[PDB]
Write a protein that binds this ligand. Sequence first.
Ligand code: NAI
Ligand code: FMN
Ligand code: SF4
Ligand code: FES
Lengths: 213, 63, 430
Amino acid sequence: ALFVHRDTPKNNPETPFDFTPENYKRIEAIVKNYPEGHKAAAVLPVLDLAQRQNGWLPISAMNKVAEILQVPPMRVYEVATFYTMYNRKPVGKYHIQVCTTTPCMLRNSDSILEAIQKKLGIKVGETTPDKLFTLIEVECLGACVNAPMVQINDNYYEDLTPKDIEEIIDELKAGKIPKPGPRSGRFSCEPAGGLTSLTEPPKGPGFGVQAGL
Amino acid sequence: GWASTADPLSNLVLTFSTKEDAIAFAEKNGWSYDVEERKVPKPKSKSYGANFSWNKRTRVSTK
Amino acid sequence: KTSFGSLKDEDRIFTNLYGRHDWRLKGAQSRGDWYKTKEILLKGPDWILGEVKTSGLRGRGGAGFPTGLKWSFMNKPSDGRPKYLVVNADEGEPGTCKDREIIRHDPHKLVEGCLVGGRAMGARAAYIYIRGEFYNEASNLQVAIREAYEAGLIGKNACGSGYDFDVFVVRGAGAYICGEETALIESIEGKQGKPRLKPPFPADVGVFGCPTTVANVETVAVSPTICRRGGAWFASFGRERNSGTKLFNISGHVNNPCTVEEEMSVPLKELIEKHAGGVTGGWDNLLAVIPGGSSTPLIPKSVCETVLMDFDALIQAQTGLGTAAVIVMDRSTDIVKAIARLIEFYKHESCGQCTPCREGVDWMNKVMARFVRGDARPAEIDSLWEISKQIEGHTICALGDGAAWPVQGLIRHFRPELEERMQRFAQQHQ
Ligand SMILES: NC(=O)C1=CN([C@@H]2O[C@H](COP(=O)(O)OP(=O)(O)OC[C@H]3O[C@@H](n4cnc5c(N)ncnc54)[C@H](O)[C@@H]3O)[C@@H](O)[C@H]2O)C=CC1
Ligand SMILES: Cc1cc2nc3c(=O)[nH]c(=O)nc-3n(C[C@H](O)[C@H](O)[C@H](O)COP(=O)(O)O)c2cc1C
Ligand code: SF4
Ligand code: FES
């Protein structure tokens, strides 16, 4: 959680890191997405891509991103420390993030938090000794009508109870991957008592088009 | 080890509104004097948008 | 018309909101999307701007600025720099999840809105800044953009109109403050997401220094329907200066939390009791409602009876429409804990560039934790009010106002509850 860096033996500028050639081609596409003279605008994706190659960002991907984009490393340090997704400390294989803002707290998300804490035997911000799960607390993740909700890696698991999140953890520990969706009856965001709107079939092309167009 | 002196006019500082009053007071009392002109800052040109230029070198690397 | 609500399914902007139909190009084109777009692009940017501003469409981001004037701000001859349209797909405000549904189930509507807006203001390309958490939504949006590129709808000679328009998707990195337009512009440029000072406005200097117009996903996706159906049809709904339809996300202590499209001037009680199935324990169990997400203050049960869910009626009730995110709290809720959690969210999501928010929001976080615990005195309460008056209006961006408003609303509507908590703590500890 510290915003300063100390050279540990496992995290130092001499730690080996380098992009794979397919990641290099992805980097060239990303820097081609931007106008010339503004290559630093590709600092945000490319550095994230480095995390997508490693799972965490030591200070060797920071310097490599600064080197391949011709920017000072202090700007890359600012970008990595400002945003919350960039892991400057090695997290476990499955990064569980539980939303505990007010709309999710109103639908009993703390029960999910203590259920995960009891099942995994760890606390918030701790990692399992097998380096499999990392449990932290996040803000609103944009699925407030499906509260309570967690996010594991890139996937969203919504409308959960303690039994559902225990089943999610059991499926993750067995080596499988669950379905990233709400655990209740509804599919994405419809009311649980059936479709209160959009029951009629869509009209199609040319419906209601004004004259003179 | 204190600071001893033999100059009586060491702590004398006189305040004048303009330069000509100080010159007249120095010439009246018979003191040989030197005068240096007032240095005012030149008016700068400040623009907040220059930090976000499109092709100029005045872009800020960070904010 | 004086009574509003009960919108028919034929008048909905966002058909296939719940993803029940195909979201790809074949499914979107069969629902009316990408239909006669060449005529829209060839009828003229001034015609598109006139059709947009005739409908009375306001900004769906939460500010409520008239989008016709805002889009016509950059309708000026070029000076060698390119012009850019930027789509705000962050949606970090609590209670708000409508743009996720728009970019997940109707991406081609967003792409067509990008093309129509870019033709309207002569923009070179579109930069859609999606949220970092929305990985699957970003992948679906990129798939739809690739499908539009392959069919010749966007890119070089877009839809056979002689206009060249590219669409780009930039993923965020998990910052709520990057949702605001100037901080979003700085985030696209590869810097810290810290807001700029206006003036200069984004229409003068925006992304890369080029002229830029930042617009919400919802206010962009409606524009092809504005151009096709006409402005008078959109202006038929809602009250005066509150025209159109709105996506409402109802959550909190309700029977069925859901996202639903409805008219602009619907009563709040009718909307909750019709689309959400009513609050838990019946309408007598309602304690408070936050109508527009965490940036807007709450209103109590007495205000909620005869309030309309548009901009003007909520401004009259000392609140705002915001993003139309209705968070409902029943009588079994520690509302002081909810407001303290909102202030803690604002403390954790704050860019920290400028002094009043950077110190004051942490100050309210500490004093609201003390208020929740009851370890305070009543004379502090008015002092906290003064602290809010030292944050609102003295900040670079509007996160300070959006953090000061919930404290003011909580104080104004529930000062006796806080005083009762403090006197109970004083009795039980002394
Ligand atoms: N949608 C969301 O996730 C959130 C929305 N909000 C809401 O958004 C609002 C605060 O955001 P802001 O962007 O600061 O709103 P507002 O102050 O800025 O202005 C909205 C737009 O109008 C433009 N504009 C206004 N006056 C102008 C002028 N004289 N000349 C040129 N352009 C002008 C601005 O550049 C901006 O693009 C509040 O209503 C708040 O409730 C707040 C938090 C989150
Ligand atoms: C702290 C803060 C966060 C914001 N987040 C978003 C957001 O996530 N999505 C959005 O569309 N507008 C957001 N806004 C509002 C924008 O400043 C701006 O109003 C919006 O991008 C475009 O508004 P429009 O609908 O009138 O075009 C935010 C504003 C502030 C102050
Ligand atoms: S009000 Fe807060 S979030 Fe906004 S510019 Fe100031 S420090 Fe940043
Ligand atoms: S409050 Fe939890 S997802 Fe928004």
